[PDB]
Paper text:
The large ribosomal RNA precursor (pre-rRNA) is transcribed by Pol I, accounting for up to 60% of total cellular RNA synthesis in Saccharomyces cerevisiae. Yeast Pol I transcription initiation is regulated by four general transcription factors: the regulatory factor Rrn3, the Core Factor, the TATA-box Binding Protein (TBP), and the Upstream Activation Factor (UAF). In addition to recruiting Pol I/Rrn3 to the ribosomal DNA (rDNA) promoter, Core Factor has also been implicated in transcription bubble opening. To gain insight into Core Factor’s role during Pol I transcription initiation, we obtained a Pol I Initial Transcribing Complex (ITC) and determined its structure to near-atomic resolution using cryo-EM.
Single particle analysis using RELION produced a reconstruction with an overall resolution of 3.8 Å (FSC = 0.143 criterion). The reconstruction shows a bipartite configuration, with the large module showing clear features of Pol I and the small lobe corresponding to Core Factor. DNA density was observed both inside and upstream of the Pol I cleft, with the upstream DNA interacting with Core Factor. Compared to similar structures determined by either crystallography in the apo form or cryo-EM in an Elongation Complex (EC), Pol I within our Initial Transcribing Complex reconstruction resembles the Elongation Complex more than the apo crystal structure, with a contracted active site cleft. The overall structure of DNA-bound Core Factor resembles a right hand holding the DNA molecule between the fingers and the palm, with the thumb pointing toward Pol I. The interaction between Core Factor and Pol I in the Initial Transcribing Complex is mainly mediated by the Rrn11 TPR domain (the thumb) and the Pol I protrusion. At this location, the duplex DNA is sandwiched between the wall and the protrusion.
Residue numbers in the entry:
A (entry chain D): 12 to 49, 80 to 100
B (entry chain B): 460 to 516
C (entry chain B): 1090 to 1143, 1146 to 1196
D (entry chain A): 1 to 141, 172 to 268, 312 to 444, 450 to 666
E (entry chain A): 1055 to 1109, 1112 to 1200, 1214 to 1276
F (entry chain A): 1555 to 1663
G (entry chain G): 8 to 170, 214 to 251
H (entry chain B): 803 to 974
Write the structure that this text describes.
RNA sequence: AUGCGA
């Protein structure tokens, strides 16, 4: 991923970030991972599941 | 000096020999055709300086 | 297609913050660092950098002369004819410049 | 070009403007100080014109990016000029402004309130409010400072009102107003302004008698004496050579004291950048160094001759080092040496050296500004018949093109062109492979570069090129079964392979015959490869549009490489769309 | 109007002998749903009235601009130059007897066809008409009392010289002005230099 | 101005008519309108070109350095409209097929 | 004037947030949600899945990856919206419009998306499960995702070795499981992103 | 068509020191298929067919320890007509560093080749018409050349008409 | 800049230049694996395919007619009279 | 740059 056909020309934020709660983070994680599971990114998604597991209590 | 001048045709001297140009005096015999070879020695030029003129008189 | 695409079409670096296509350079990599696009004009000398009154983390890039820079990471690539690059050669000597605008940074 | 490599950062405009020595020093990849060019009889001199910081060379990587001669784009160095000198291109300008100043007050010899009136007109003409610019002249009332300030107040009030109206009315914008008529009214105004600026043959704001300024032509200004009537008039109001340095020190202060008008005098549009107008723009305190990439030597068949830029720039560096040597004389002398007039010769070195270096910078800019076939400078490089702009910008050589003597043939269509199989096998189209063209391109690859509708090369979606110039029928057979392979990298999953197929009977080609005299002389014809031909074959019906005849006429054949250029050459430029001329609409 | 279209735009009789073919090309039923067929035609009727009312150049009743000024000629069929409209109507009137020999075409369906040909003959948005102009003046100038040919064209186009080489002013002479009066006036305006009257000059320098 | 315009179109029409050349009046009429665009008799040489707004078009005709100097001294900005100027920067020419843009309608569901 | 340029350094080099310790007993909320605007390319092959095109092309490679602009490793995206190229179409249309380049079949579009980014800063107190223990570092893993290492020099000498043997804490028992540290530095110039931690502050 | 070439090894040498290149070989490692064109003395066999890429000579420079060759670069094949060894004007130069090689390129009449009468009415050959397809006279012949009649009305080359009828009478 | 759809005032007809660009760009898209919305019917030339797509007006392209002011009119293929 | 082909 090195050129326009893969990488965005420009990225800008429109507001100052918002400190998503643990509960909002977990709900986002579950919705994103669950919606995506239904491609080497899958392996990073597996890491997101570990984050999910770490934000769930136990590895 | 005469091989160089005869090999380029850029004749230059402290009087200019009273001639309107300092190049073009020499031509390759270009023997590609006997017609061309004999024609070179019966060719005469009005000179480059009149080649530069815009008119036709 | 004729006067460009089939002649000297070049994707050339331009600095989105300074509007020139000739200060751009490839920053030097390291065993842990890739080659990164940097604009020389948009980079502070690591010897200054308000260091007397003052880092982001990823704004230091190094020159083949081992020179540290801060910034210069805001340049992109745009399609132009290479002779255009030839213009900075003479024009930049002429003490003038091209501010090649684009996008809207 | 590749359709597989888009960009989305197009240039939308081009700003022009002068550099600054601090900008050059900050961007500069190196200072070049050594008038040497090569070292060890065969090496790039350290910190010289061929230092590797100025790009890659001789398998030496660019010392500024570490990139090969085939990869390094190159980087621009700079020269710290001994003195300041004069920018030739603006020498006519700065000379005018020298003649326009007052030397005892350092103001323009034109009435200050009249100057402010000029600033008003040029401000209204940045927004192109011409009717208001002319309406300003009407504001009218020994003249008190309260009254001249009342004129400045009323005029500023008119600028503020006419602007507030025009921005309210959207009849202009913060970005200015620019049209052919506005440009013309500006040039007219700035001309009359320069005539008023030059008209004052003594000052007015200070009443002082400025000297008459004379010039050599391109390297020296002199300051003429005054008359005892004017000198004693100056006291009651109480030719000399000058250096570029003195001019710079005067013009800095004059250009600062008159910044308020010059803000709009030096911009035809609003200076949004609040850029101060500095005198250092007409003088060169430093000199840049072009990329080595553009300084390569002139090798003609075998002979390697040094670049003429290296020669003129080396002359600047040598002369500059001589002046540096005079500065060595200042470290040398100047302890005190109270009566050593010995420096009377070093003073000849200062005048001669200084005019000499200035002249040599001029010569490097414009050969016709120095003092037998003098290497050309950038001014000669850019202009005349060539004008880099004309010979390599407004027209260029092009790839995917052929030239050949045309031969008649009545059996082809009147819209086709008979392409000899040398061109049919030597001209390619970059065809992306799909499910619908896999058969044809697989066959073309199987044929190889040495057949008919085969294909010379295959460009992967990964960007790499695989030439078929020397592959065997076996290897090309193997690649034919790989033209349709799956994705491999998320970086490339959106692309499909490309095949450089030979020109064939389904492509359109743009034929041009010199005379171009009109658009109808360069039409698109449908390619028909003719066997055992060696000449571009053309139907007789076209010969009255090209004004072509088989006597020996040669034609250029252009092969467009893009579906946009194909569709246009089949729909807009095509011969059938040219059955009538626009001159008269009589069939040609 | 595009020059590459105009050639037959004023050849009505030909279009008539090929009426049904051109009706098959430019069939309007496909297009009559995308445009207006009346607004311009109505302006054409009121303006044709005012135009026949004022059919002296600079004491006419200026009030009605041409239909091309008031309606996009590509959108309301009938917005056409008054010269073309005039020629078309005059053709339909001078051939009413040809309109009494046809299978059945009429000046309203034929006039409709010629208006639609006019709409379909217009220059496309974006046409490179500048370049086309320049080539249409240059290219034919290669075949080339007052200055003629290329020097004359250069004297105008290239230099716009305020000093013509052969400046002339044409003077129309009233119908009442006799030819003999005209020769008298020709003598009366021409310059007469003093040299032109001198026969001999004898200087006897004595000192 | 209108009389000089009609005189131009008549004089050029006479020059071509002398050689029995047909030339559409639309061409001559356009050229005349362009020579009078400022209300005067603005020839087509460098002098008339000075008043045009595209600095690259000036640069690419004649006195390249003179137009460059007058441009820099102005701090001019090129709005990159001239076809020549646009070629200089490797931009789709604004004439003809580049007189407009093409976008795509794409399904959102 | 000489303070415009220093306003340029401070106001251009300012940092947005200082993620605090949750309840002052957890870890810093370096995970934040920030709505951004990106400019991405759309291939023709996704012309029938354009939001999915933008996803598979640009946004999918961004997850679990550091972005200098966002200041962290993108934890995920929320609410993709293609900015319509054409007004007078409300906001809920059945098709959008996008500009195609004047040279290629590729499209370019504006996108608005919320990013979930892990934005750690120096001073943040974090806990990790010990990955490794070598005599110059202790490897840990934050949330089972972020690699972290505390080199011997940044650990208090008052810590105790037990022989790759084992480290024993300053209290007199060997370390085990999780460690609480302050963030000294984050190294993202390499292939991945290593967070430099300290046990001495 | 004959093209003459000078293969010089001093064209820009530098006296005694410089000399080291000798036509021939040394490393053996060269492709022995070069003998297919160059004789064991380093000069091509007079008569050899050569196509672009074939070696026109081979030599050896001690500094490079390599067998080098001067390649032939042309659009068409030729044949070597003469190879002339030049030691001349030299003081010693015994190493035979200058060689003149003449290439013979045959030029068959072909479509596009120009032909002209003694009347300045020049034309390219549009095609090489089959003899069967040519027109044949009742004399049993088919012409060598066919010239379009419509060329004469503008040129008024009627001297060519008379030359045709005079050459016909004079041949008969 | 947005010329309201109710206010579009330009030629209802597709110019030859408009048709040329549409057919070229759309053809190029089909040649880069844009989804074909019509039967390929045997064809292999992407340009003739785009011509078929124009013949059925299935093309999903829009012409942005520029005005020198900067206002523009977004026109569908499915409305601009093709010829 | 000279000559020259169209
Ligand atoms: Zn920059
Ligand atoms: Zn470099
Ligand atoms: Zn004064």
């Amino acid at each position: 991923t090195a050129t326009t056909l893969n990488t965005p020309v420009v990225i800008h934020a429109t507001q100052l970030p918002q400190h998503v709660s643990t509960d909002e983070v977990l709900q986002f994680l579950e919705s994103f991972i669950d919606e995506k599971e239904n491609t080497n990114l899958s392996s990073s998604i597996s890491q997101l599941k570990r984050i999910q597991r770490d934000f769930k209590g136990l590895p | 000096k005469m091989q160089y001048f005869l090999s380029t045709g850029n004749l230059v001297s402290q009087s200019g020999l009273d001639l309107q140009q300092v190049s073009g005096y020499t031509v390759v015999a270009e023997k590609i055709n006997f017609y061309r070879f004999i024609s070179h020695f019966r060719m005469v030029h009005r000179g480059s300086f009149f080649a530069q003129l815009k008119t036709t008189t | 297609d004729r006067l460009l695409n089939s002649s000297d079409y070049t994707q050339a670096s331009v600095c989105r913050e300074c509007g020139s296509i000739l200060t751009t350079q490839q920053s030097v990599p390291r065993i842990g660092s890739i080659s990164t696009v940097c604009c020389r004009r948009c980079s502070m000398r690591f010897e200054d950098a308000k260091k007397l009154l003052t880092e982001d983390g990823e704004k230091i890039f190094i020159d083949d002369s081992q020179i540290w820079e801060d910034g210069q990471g805001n340049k992109f690539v745009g399609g132009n004819e290479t002779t255009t690059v030839a213009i900075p050669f003479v024009l930049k000597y002429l003490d003038s410049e091209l501010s090649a605008m684009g996008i809207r940074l | 070009m590749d359709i597989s490599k888009p960009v989305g950062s197009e240039i939308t405009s081009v700003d022009f403007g002068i550099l600054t020595a601090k900008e050059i020093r900050n961007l500069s990849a190196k200072q070049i100080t050594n008038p040497t060019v090569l070292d060890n009889l065969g090496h790039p001199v350290s910190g010289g014109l061929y230092d590797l910081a100025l790009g890659a060379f001789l398998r030496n990587l660019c010392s500024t990016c570490g990139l090969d001669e085939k990869f390094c784009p190159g980087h621009q160095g700079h020269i710290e000029l001994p003195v300041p000198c004069y920018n030739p291109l603006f020498f006519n300008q700065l000379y005018i402004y020298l003649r326009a100043s007052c030397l005892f007050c350092h103001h323009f010899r034109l009435k200050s309130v009249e100057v402010h009136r000029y600033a008003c007109k040029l401000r209204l003409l940045q927004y192109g409010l011409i009717d208001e610019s002319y309406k300003l002249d009407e504001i009218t009332l020994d003249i008190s400072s309260t009254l001249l300030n009342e004129l400045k107040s009323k005029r500023s009030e008119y600028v503020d009102m006419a602007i507030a109206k025009a921005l309210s009315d959207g009849r202009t914008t913060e970005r200015g107003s620019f049209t052919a008529t506005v440009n013309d009214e500006r040039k007219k105004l700035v001309h009359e302004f320069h005539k008023k600026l030059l008209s004052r043959g003594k000052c007015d704001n200070c009443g002082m008698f400025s000297p008459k300024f004379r010039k050599d032509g391109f390297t020296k200004i002199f300051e003429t004496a005054l008359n005892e009537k004017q000198i004693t008039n100056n006291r009651v109001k109480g030719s000399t050579y000058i250096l570029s340095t003195e001019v710079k020190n005067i013009l800095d202060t004059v250009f600062r004291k008159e910044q308020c008008v010059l803000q709009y005098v030096f911009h035809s549009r609003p200076n949004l950048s609040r850029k101060l107008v500095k005198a250092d723009s007409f003088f060169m305190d430093v000199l840049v160094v072009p990329p080595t990439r553009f300084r390569l030597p002139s090798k003609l068949g075998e002979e390697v001759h040094e670049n003429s830029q290296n020669q003129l720039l080396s002359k600047v560096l040598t002369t500059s080092l001589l002046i540096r040597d005079l500065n060595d004389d200042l470290s040398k002398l100047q302890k005190d040496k109270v009566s050593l007039e010995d420096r009377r010769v070093i003073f000849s070195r200062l005048m001669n050296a200084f005019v000499t270096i200035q002249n040599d910078v001029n010569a490097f800019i414009d050969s016709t500004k120095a003092q037998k076939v003098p290497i050309p400078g950038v001014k000669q490089a850019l202009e005349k018949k060539e004008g880099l702009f004309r010979k390599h910008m407004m027209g260029k050589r092009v790839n995917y093109a052929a030239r050949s003597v045309i031969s008649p043939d009545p059996n082809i269509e009147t819209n086709e062109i008979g392409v000899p199989p040398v061109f049919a096998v030597k001209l390619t189209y970059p065809e992306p492979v799909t499910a619908y063209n896999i058969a044809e391109l697989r066959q073309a690859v199987i044929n190889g570069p040495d057949k008919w509708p085969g294909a010379t090369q295959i460009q992967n979606e990964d960007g790499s090129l695989v030439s078929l110039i020397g592959m065997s029928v076996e290897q090309r057979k193997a690649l034919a079964n790989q033209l349709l392979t799956p994705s491999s990298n998320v970086s490339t999953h959106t692309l499909n392979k490309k095949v450089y197929r030979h020109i064939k009977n389904r492509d359109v080609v743009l034929m041009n015959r010199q005379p171009t005299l009109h658009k109808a002389s360069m039409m698109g014809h449908k390619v028909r490869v003719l066997p055992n031909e060696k000449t571009l074959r053309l139907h007789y019906a076209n010969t009255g549009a090209y004004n072509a005849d088989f006597d020996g006429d040669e034609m250029n054949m252009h092969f467009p490489q893009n579906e946009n250029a194909r569709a246009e050459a089949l729909n807009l430029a095509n011969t059938d769309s040219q059955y009538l001329t626009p001159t008269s609409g009589s069939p040609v | 109007i595009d020059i590459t279209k105009e050639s037959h735009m004023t050849q009505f009789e030909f279009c008539l002998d090929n009426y049904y073919a051109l009706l098959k090309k430019y069939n309007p039923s496909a297009l009559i749903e995308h445009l207006d067929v009346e607004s311009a035609l109505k302006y054409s009727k009121k303006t044709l009235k005012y135009r026949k009312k004022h059919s002296p150049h600079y004491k006419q009743s200026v009030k009605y601009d041409p239909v091309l000024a008031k309606y996009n000629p590509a959108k309301y069929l009938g917005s056409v130059s008054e010269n073309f409209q005039d020629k078309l109507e005059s053709f339909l009137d001078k051939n009413s007897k040809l309109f009494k020999s046809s299978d059945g075409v009429n000046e309203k369906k034929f006039r409709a066809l010629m208006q639609l040909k006019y709409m379909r003959s217009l220059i496309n948005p974006g046409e490179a008409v500048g370049i086309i102009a320049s080539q249409s003046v240059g290219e034919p100038s290669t075949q080339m009392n007052v200055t003629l040919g290329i020097p004359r064209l250069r004297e105008i186009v290239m230099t716009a010289s305020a000093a013509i080489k052969t400046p002339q002013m044409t003077l129309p002479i009233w119908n009442d002005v006799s030819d003999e009066q005209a020769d008298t006036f020709c003598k009366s305006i021409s310059k007469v230099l003093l040299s032109e009257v001198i026969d001999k000059v004898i200087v006897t320098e004595t000192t | 101005v209108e009389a000089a315009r009609n005189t131009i179109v008549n004089e050029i029409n006479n020059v071509f008519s002398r050689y029995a050349i047909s030339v559409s009046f639309r061409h001559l009429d356009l050229i005349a309108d362009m020579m009078t665009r400022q209300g005067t008799y603005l020839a087509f040489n460098r002098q008339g070109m000075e008043t045009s707004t595209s600095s690259f078009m000036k640069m690419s005709y004649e006195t390249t350095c003179q137009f460059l100097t007058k441009a820099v001294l102005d701090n001019e900005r090129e709005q990159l409209d001239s076809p020549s100027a646009r070629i200089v920067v490797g931009k789709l020419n604004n004439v003809g097929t580049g007189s407009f843009d093409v976008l795509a309608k794409v399904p959102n569901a | 004037n000489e303070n415009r340029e220093t306003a340029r350094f401070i106001k251009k080099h300012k940092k947005q947030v200082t993620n605090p310790i949750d309840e002052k007993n957890g870890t810093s909320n370096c995970i934040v949600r920030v709505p951004i605007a990106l400019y991405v390319s759309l291939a023709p092959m996704y012309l029938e899945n354009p939001l999915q095109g933008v996803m598979k092309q640009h946004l999918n490679p961004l997850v679990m990856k550091y972005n200098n602009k966002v200041g962290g490793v993108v934890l995920g995206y929320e609410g993709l919206k293609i900015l319509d190229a054409d007004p007078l179409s409300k906001e809920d249309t059945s098709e959008k419009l996008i500009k195609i380049t004047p040279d290629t079949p590729f499209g370019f579009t504006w996108c608005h998306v919320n990013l979930y980014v892990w934005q750690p800063q120096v001073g943040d107190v974090l806990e990790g499960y010990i990955f490794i223990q070598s005599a110059s570092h202790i490897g840990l893993l934050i949330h089972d995702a972020f690699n972290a290492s505390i080199k011997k020099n940044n650990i208090p000498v008052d810590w105790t070795f037990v022989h790759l043997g084992h480290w024993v804490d300053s209290n007199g028992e060997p370390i085990d499981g999780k460690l609480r540290f302050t963030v000294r530095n984050v190294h993202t110039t390499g292939r991945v992103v290593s967070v430099d931690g300290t046990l001495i502050s | 068509m004959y093209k003459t070439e000078k293969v010089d090894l001093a064209l820009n040498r530098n006296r005694g020191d410089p000399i080291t290149q000798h036509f021939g070989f040394g490393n053996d490692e060269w492709p022995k298929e070069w003998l297919e064109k160059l004789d064991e003395d380093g000069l091509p066999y007079i008569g050899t067919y050569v196509e672009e890429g074939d070696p026109i000579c081979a030599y050896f420079d001690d500094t490079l320890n390599k067998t080098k060759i001067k390649t032939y670069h042309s659009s068409e094949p030729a044949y070597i007509e003469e190879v002339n060894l030049i030691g001349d004007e030299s003081n010693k130069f015994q190493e035979l560093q200058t060689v003149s090689i003449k290439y013979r390129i045959r030029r068959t009449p072909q479509i596009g080749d120009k032909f002209s009468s003694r009347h300045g009415q020049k034309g390219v050959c549009s095609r090489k018409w089959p003899t069967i397809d040519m027109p044949f006279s009742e004399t049993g012949i088919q012409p060598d050349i066919i010239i379009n009649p419509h060329a004469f009305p503008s040129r008024m080359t009627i001297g060519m008409f008379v030359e045709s009828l005079a050459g016909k009478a004079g041949a008969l | 800049k947005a010329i309201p759809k109710d206010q579009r005032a330009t030629t209802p007809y597709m110019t030859k230049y408009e048709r040329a660009r549409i057919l070229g760009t759309r053809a190029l898209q089909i040649s880069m694996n844009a989804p074909v919305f019509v039967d390929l019917e045997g064809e292999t030339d992407p340009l003739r395919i785009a011509m078929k797509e124009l013949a059925e007006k299935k093309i999903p392209l829009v012409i942005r007619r520029y005005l020198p002011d900067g206002s523009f009119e977004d026109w569908s293929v499915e409305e601009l009279i093709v010829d």
